[PDB]
Amino acid sequence: MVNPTVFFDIAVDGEPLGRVSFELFADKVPKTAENFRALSTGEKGFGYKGSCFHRIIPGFMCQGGDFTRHNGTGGKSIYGEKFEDENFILKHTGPGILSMANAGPNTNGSQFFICTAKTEWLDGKHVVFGKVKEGMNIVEAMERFGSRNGKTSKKITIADCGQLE
Amino acid sequence: PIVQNLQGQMVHQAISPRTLNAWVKVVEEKAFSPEVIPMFSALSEGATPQDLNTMLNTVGGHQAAMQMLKETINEEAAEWDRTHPPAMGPLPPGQIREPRGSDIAGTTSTLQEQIGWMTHNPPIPVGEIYKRWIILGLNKIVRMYS
Secondary structure, rough: OOOEEEEEEEEEEEEEEEEEEEEEEEOHHHHHHHHHHHHOOOOOOOOOOOOOOEEEEOOOOEEOOOOOOOOOOOOOOOOOOEEEEOOOOOOOOOOOOOEOOOOOOOOOOOOOHHHHHHOOOHHOOOEEEEEEEEOOOHHHHHHOOOOOOOOOOOOOOEEEEOOOO | EEOOOOOOOEOOOOOOHHHHHHHHHHHHHHHOOHHHHHHHHOOOOOOOOHHHHHHHOOOOHHHHHHHHHHHHHHHHHHHHHHHHHOOOOOOOOOOOOOOOOOHOOOOOOOOHHHHHHHHHOOOOOOHHHHHHHHHHHHHHHHHHHH
């Protein structure tokens, strides 16, 4: 298949919560997709396994992928440093959209976020590159651990991840 | 400027032509003498960066000075940027973008923006930051010319 499928098994203070799978839109944003794909398999020797969702704001989104510093200050792409916004074709149309976190234009690393509502005001600013396929309810359960400022009440981890399909 | 409304909450007012005219006259009288510095601060109470810009941009003459001031400012902005890594997005609903160095100096920000930062809870004090940079540039001008 042109579009890969990846999974995250999510844990809460080490206890399994469930599985969330995502379709990656390699047919629209191949480079961004292959970054997340590769980070999810650990095939380069590094990636998401064991990292945490360090910022969750209920009603807005769940943000993770800082596997080097665990707090929003790190992360790294498979490209050997931050990479350009591939395009802004896909919109943040509702819950389950997967999109690249960034600190300004052309600074994509490994941090990403899963929308839990429509987030129109991000369009043109964050590259959308996938959607949740199974397990939206797991994402919604994750929002129960967040707060207005994003600090989480419990340690939300990707206990395992990889590719499916 | 942003002024304290005696019923609560900070409010914006249009730049004051009187305040302006008093600054302009300070500048025509005293030719970059050290007393300009406290006067600048005395007349820029609650100023937005756009207000400060208007105050500086109206000083007729002294183009060399004004351009040396610009350079101190643009320097200070660049430095601020280099010392404050941009906060990670995505931006939460209801939040305004954080100000960079060029935003604080009012060169890439709108008045609406500057209003929003300075009136936010708590205020993000772009006018006071800028004002410190401007004072630093004034120091340099007073040392050149006096």
